[PDB]
Design an enzyme around this catalytic site. Structure first.
Site, mmCIF file in Angstrom:
data_model
loop_
_atom_site.group_PDB
_atom_site.id
_atom_site.type_symbol
_atom_site.label_atom_id
_atom_site.label_comp_id
_atom_site.label_asym_id
_atom_site.label_seq_id
_atom_site.Cartn_x
_atom_site.Cartn_y
_atom_site.Cartn_z
ATOM 1 N N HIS A 136 51.840 31.137 29.166
ATOM 2 C CA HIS A 136 52.041 32.469 29.750
ATOM 3 C C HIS A 136 50.703 33.119 30.127
ATOM 4 O O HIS A 136 50.537 33.652 31.234
ATOM 5 C CB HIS A 136 52.823 33.341 28.730
ATOM 6 C CG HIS A 136 53.070 34.745 29.194
ATOM 7 N ND1 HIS A 136 54.333 35.212 29.493
ATOM 8 C CD2 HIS A 136 52.232 35.802 29.326
ATOM 9 C CE1 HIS A 136 54.252 36.501 29.802
ATOM 10 N NE2 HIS A 136 52.992 36.882 29.709
ATOM 11 N N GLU A 137 49.747 33.133 29.201
ATOM 12 C CA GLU A 137 48.449 33.704 29.516
ATOM 13 C C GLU A 137 47.748 32.911 30.639
ATOM 14 O O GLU A 137 47.083 33.503 31.497
ATOM 15 C CB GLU A 137 47.551 33.758 28.274
ATOM 16 C CG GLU A 137 48.144 34.400 27.051
ATOM 17 C CD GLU A 137 48.597 35.828 27.288
ATOM 18 O OE1 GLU A 137 49.361 36.356 26.446
ATOM 19 O OE2 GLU A 137 48.204 36.436 28.299
ATOM 20 N N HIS A 182 48.968 34.059 34.019
ATOM 21 C CA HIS A 182 48.244 35.252 34.448
ATOM 22 C C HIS A 182 46.858 34.884 34.941
ATOM 23 O O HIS A 182 46.376 35.441 35.933
ATOM 24 C CB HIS A 182 48.075 36.270 33.308
ATOM 25 C CG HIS A 182 49.332 37.004 32.893
ATOM 26 N ND1 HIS A 182 50.123 37.742 33.760
ATOM 27 C CD2 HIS A 182 49.841 37.224 31.649
ATOM 28 C CE1 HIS A 182 51.075 38.342 33.065
ATOM 29 N NE2 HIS A 182 50.944 38.008 31.794
ATOM 30 N N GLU A 186 54.125 41.175 34.891
ATOM 31 C CA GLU A 186 54.756 40.517 33.760
ATOM 32 C C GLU A 186 56.080 39.898 34.145
ATOM 33 O O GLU A 186 56.385 38.784 33.713
ATOM 34 C CB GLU A 186 55.008 41.542 32.631
ATOM 35 C CG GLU A 186 53.688 42.019 31.984
ATOM 36 C CD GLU A 186 52.908 40.904 31.313
ATOM 37 O OE1 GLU A 186 53.448 39.782 31.109
ATOM 38 O OE2 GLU A 186 51.732 41.181 30.967
HETATM 39 S S1 LIG Z 1 46.149 37.570 31.039
HETATM 40 C C1 LIG Z 1 46.568 39.200 31.714
HETATM 41 C C2 LIG Z 1 46.773 40.210 30.592
HETATM 42 C C3 LIG Z 1 47.742 39.704 29.533
HETATM 43 C C4 LIG Z 1 48.294 40.794 28.596
HETATM 44 C C5 LIG Z 1 49.102 40.148 27.457
HETATM 45 C C6 LIG Z 1 50.404 39.575 28.038
HETATM 46 O O1 LIG Z 1 50.454 38.695 28.831
HETATM 47 N N1 LIG Z 1 51.631 40.157 27.616
HETATM 48 O O2 LIG Z 1 52.829 39.677 28.207
HETATM 49 ZN ZN LIG Z 2 52.039 38.683 30.104
#
Ligand SMILES: *SCCCCCC(=O)NO
Ligand SMILES: [Zn+2]
EC number: 3.4.24.69
Length: 414
Positions: A215-216, A219, A254
């Site tokens: 997940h990270e 992002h 998100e």
């Molecule tokens: S990596 C971008 C910020 C991530 C913040 C934590 C997260 O992903 N919560 O869902």
């Molecule tokens: Zn996130």
């Protein structure tokens, strides 16, 4: 194999892939860091460096704290914890790389070099200094894309920090510092109605931390391609009566990253607006590359760096050497980064139990120890083949596999 060296924290520095490093600009003393793959480093330290606002590890005033927060100023202060942190993070990258989707995502991340948009003159292509780290020895600077670092004061706030032109949203990209721990994980509930209710459930099932890291990294993929959605573009949740009671607002970034049914709460019209915005950003990058006739520095040739960004952004190149953005190829890459790389799709590849929506309520945080193969493996996670944990996600079941989970805090009711 994604990480081809089995690092130990006490391994001697060699100035190449085990080194003391500093972040340009930043106050900070050199920290021992490990290059686990091309462009990817791990710093087994609590993050007191990236944000000047955050130097301390003790809790802020309690009035300042969110409900789903967890503080422990002693975590990751000893050599053995840093050894296990390093080994845990490398194990999670291997678990991600062992799936076709994770191999694709990690290939995108390594190819996602932050754009050389540092020049003040059109005719020159120049790096941006804060997309580098300084490797101490004298020092030598080196470009990189991703750093996994320990959390700051709030252990379960896995934020991404970067330096910056709004580099995560203008197509350029910037080096991403991900706050992350493999030593904690969250509990969720197997019934959707319970998981999305803030008053019910103790957190029977444990999230596989490979999904959390993926997940990270999703992002970080958006951010390295400069296509993250502005955090102030949010879904004012009207599908969960408790979200509406608390007025919880969840960013489109998100909902996109989770994927599945959550991404449909981004309306077609606002998605088209984001797509057109980022398409125009990629056009500006092609235009910048076409104006550059010389390169600054000694690390690479002008034609090598032009080709690096042609490959990154899927630019088309005519017979005159000029770059352009083809909408079919832009759409393919953008969709790859935003719709193919999602948490929901990783769950499908790992075959683990997981939350069904981002729009739930966290139940608990557990201490875990994934480094021993008797606890967790690259290919099975907690659900170890040929044991009583192999079936029915029994290894994630904190009541069956109770020795693998220590509950540290309950969030239900808060
Ligand atoms: S990596 C971008 C910020 C991530 C913040 C934590 C997260 O992903 N919560 O869902
Ligand atoms: Zn996130």
């Amino acid at each position: 194999q994604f990480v081809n060296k089995q690092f130990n924290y006490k391994d001697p520095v060699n100035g190449v892939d085990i080194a003391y490093i500093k972040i340009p600009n930043v106050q900070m003393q050199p920290v021992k860091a490990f290059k686990i793959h091309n462009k990817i480093w791990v710093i087994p330290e609590r993050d007191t460096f990236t944000n000047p606002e955050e130097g301390d590890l003790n809790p802020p005033p309690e009035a300042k704290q969110v409900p789903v927060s967890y503080y422990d100023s002693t975590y990751l202060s000893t050599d053995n914890e840093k050894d296990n942190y390093l080994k845990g993070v490398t194990k999670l990258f291997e678990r991600i790389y062992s799936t076709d989707l994770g191999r694709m995502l990690l290939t995108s991340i390594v190819r996602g070099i932050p754009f050389w948009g540092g020049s003040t003159i059109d005719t020159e292509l120049k790096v941006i200094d804060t997309n580098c780290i300084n490797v101490i020895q004298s020092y030598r600077s080196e470009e990189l894309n991703l750093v996994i670092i320990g959390p700051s004061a709030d252990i379960i706030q896995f934020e991404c920090k970067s330096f910056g032109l709004n580099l995560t949203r203008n197509g350029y990209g910037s080096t991403q510092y991900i706050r992350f721990s493999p030593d904690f994980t969250f509990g969720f509930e197997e019934s959707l109605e319970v998981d999305t209710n803030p008053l019910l459930g103790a957190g029977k099932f444990a999230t596989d931390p490979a999904v959390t890291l993926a997940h990270e990294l999703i992002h970080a993929g958006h951010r390295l391609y400069g296509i993250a959605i502005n955090p102030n573009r949010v879904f004012k949740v009207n599908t969960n009566a408790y979200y509406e009671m608390s007025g919880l607002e969840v960013s489109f970034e998100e909902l996109r990253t989770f994927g599945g049914h959550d991404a449909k709460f981004i309306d077609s019209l606002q998605e088209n607006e984001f797509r057109l915005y980022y398409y125009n950003k990629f056009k500006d990058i092609a235009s910048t590359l076409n104006k550059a006739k010389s390169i600054v520095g000694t690390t690479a040739s002008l034609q090598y760096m032009k080709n690096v960004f042609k490959e990154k952004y899927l630019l088309s190149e005519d017979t005159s050497g000029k770059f352009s953005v083809d909408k079919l190829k832009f759409d393919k890459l953008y969709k790859m980064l935003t719709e193919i790389y999602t948490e929901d799709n990783f769950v499908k590849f790992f075959k683990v139990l997981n939350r069904k929506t981002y729009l739930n309520f966290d139940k608990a945080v557990f201490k875990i120890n994934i480094v021993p193969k008797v606890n967790y493996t690259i290919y099975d996670g907690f659900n170890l083949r040929n044991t009583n944990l192999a079936a029915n996600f029994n290894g994630q079941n904190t009541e069956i596999n109770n020795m693998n989970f220590t509950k540290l805090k309950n969030f239900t009711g808060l």
